[PDB]
Structure formats: structure tokens, C-alpha cells
Amino acid sequence: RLVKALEDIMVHYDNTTRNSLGNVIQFIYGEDGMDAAHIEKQSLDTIGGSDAAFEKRYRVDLLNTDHTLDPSLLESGSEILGDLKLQVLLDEEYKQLVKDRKFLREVFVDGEANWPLPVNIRRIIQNAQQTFHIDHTKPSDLTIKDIVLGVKDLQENLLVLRGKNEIIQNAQRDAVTLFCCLLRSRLATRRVLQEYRLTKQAFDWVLSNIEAQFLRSVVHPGEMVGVLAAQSIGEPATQMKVTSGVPRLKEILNVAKNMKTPSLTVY
Amino acid sequence: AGRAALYKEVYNVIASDGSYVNYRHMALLVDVMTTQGGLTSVTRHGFNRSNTGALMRCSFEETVEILFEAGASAELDDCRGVSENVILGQMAPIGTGAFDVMIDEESLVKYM
């Protein structure tokens, strides 16, 4: 029954998920446009932790001593201090990180950090570290402006919808917002300069791999997602106070008016 | 909110025994069931009752009645569905068939 119901659902070339009549089921597949097989469980570092821990992890101040950075972290560790424009860049980056923290806390009420996201940033960082032989002692060649502008350009290059109008651009931003939150969570100035200690070539290589993997993880138009969903729901049912299992699935799909255990929850 | 509750119910059913199914499959299911403004049941009286083509609809349940109603109503089937092309034995517009492969004379001459 499920397969017959979902047999005509398909992802078309404008990323909308339509049936045989052309009716729009989803304006983008899976609400992110990503192939299911290219999704891995990853942790969102912004949503978790404490405010003091969050500041220690992300906040970088070039004008004070409470949240300053070790000048030995990067090559220009003694020239950045006292700068005004770079401090503006850090201010806006940390403001964006705080906005992402609030947004993710709004999306997940329980604050769950590990969620399925397309591209595994951690493995890319580890691959760069092992390939470029990060000695963790030499000051990084990266400049902070380089990090900020590279992250911004990388976000600009994560394209799911290629349209050239405001509707499609807004949908593209809404589709890539969560992965951009993860990317900003991982590729922060403090984290890149201290926790990972990327170099210029290593940072550029990381950016290139993130962009390539994200563009590879996009769902392919022509994917028969309806039959895929029907099978991915029916097959686990074969392996199987309140009714559950096969009878509850039967009740749900039939949308039966009368149900065995009609229960309600009050908070 | 009905679609959200339907997805939560389906997810609870799936994860009751500890199994995990990706979000997007159940999301597609609950979006199909709630795309008409009301909860569409997965049954002949449910999805099988939709102007989505006589040949597709009949292949599920109540075949001859569907054919009779289509003949009486003079329905036009556009053969955009998988079941129509399966019945007619032609490449369905799915997967590899979701597009047309053509030949560029100018490019072929450009090669040599």
C-alpha cells in the first residue's frame, strides 16, 4: 500500500518533489535537498555548552586580555593586537555565532547536538591535519581576515538551488542554513587558529573539500524518493499502555477514526 | 500541525523498537498524506481516489470500477506516471528516464 501510494513521487530538476500530476509535495527534497546516503551524524558545538564555555571556545578579542589569543598561534600574533578592522571582523563573526547558537536552540527544544548533516567536517579537518603535517608548534601562517573571508566565500559557494531570483535565493539560504551553522561552528577563528592550527594551504584545502563534498551530497534530480521512502518505512516494520508496532502503523496509514488507545498529553 | 503530529507518530512507531529511519523518508510520507489539505489515508479510498490518471489508480485496487468511471467521464491520461508507462511498456520518466539524451551536430563536427 505504501509503495503504491508513493510510487509517482520524484525529485525534479528544480529540486521540487512532485508526483505524476506535477503537484508539489516538497519545494525541496527532505527540506534540505540532500541525498540520504550522503548524510552522517555530526555534533553542533554552538548549541551545547555554557555561555562562559562558549565565549572561551569562540570569542576572540584583539583589544583586551580576558579573551585575547596567544600571539604564537599565528604568524602575525603581535601585529593584529591593536587593530580595529580585524576586531570588527571578530565582532561580527562572534555575533553570527551567537545568532546561530540562539537559532539552533530554537530549532531543537531539547538542545540535542548530534544531528544528521551532509558533510563530515571533522574528517576533512583530520585529513588536512595528517596530509599537511601540522606540527602544532610553529605559528600558523593564516591571517584572521583570510579565515573570515574564506568562511564567507565557502558559505556563498554552497549552492543547492541555482536560480537567479529572490525566491530561489531565499530558498537556497533556508536550505543551507543548518549546514552553514555547523560550518561556522567548526571553522571559527579561535578553533582554526588554536584547536586545529590550520595553515594557509591547509585551510584552503579544507574549504575546497567542504565545497566539493557539499556539492556532491546534493540529491540528484530524477531520484525516485517516493518508492525509496515507502520501502524505507515498510522494511523496518517487517523486523518488528499504548499500541505500537504493526497495528499502530496500520491505524496511522488507514487514518482510522476509532483507535485502540486514544491518549493525550498535558504539560 | 496535523502533518507535524503525523510525522511524530510515524517516528514514534519506527523508533519504538530502537530502529532508526532518516527524517526525509517519513517527511515525504507525511507530506504526501497531508498535501490535499486533509489527512489522505494510504488506501483505495485514500490516495487511490485522486485525478492522477486512470491507469495508475486502477493498478492498486478496484481496477474495473476505475476503468468504468474513467470511460464514463472520458478521462484523459497524460502518461506522466510510472504505472502508465509500465502498463504501456515504455521508458518511464524516472531515474535515467527523467530526461532526453540528444545529439549535437556542431559539437560532433567540432571533434573532427
Binding site: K250, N254, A256, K257 | T43, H45
Partner: peptide, 10 residues
Amino acid sequence: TXPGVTXPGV
């Protein structure tokens, strides 16, 4: 119901 287990009704 259903059928099986029309409707109800019809």
C-alpha cells in the same frame, strides 16, 4: 472497516 478491518463507512 477498510476493507478489510468499506470505511467506515462505504
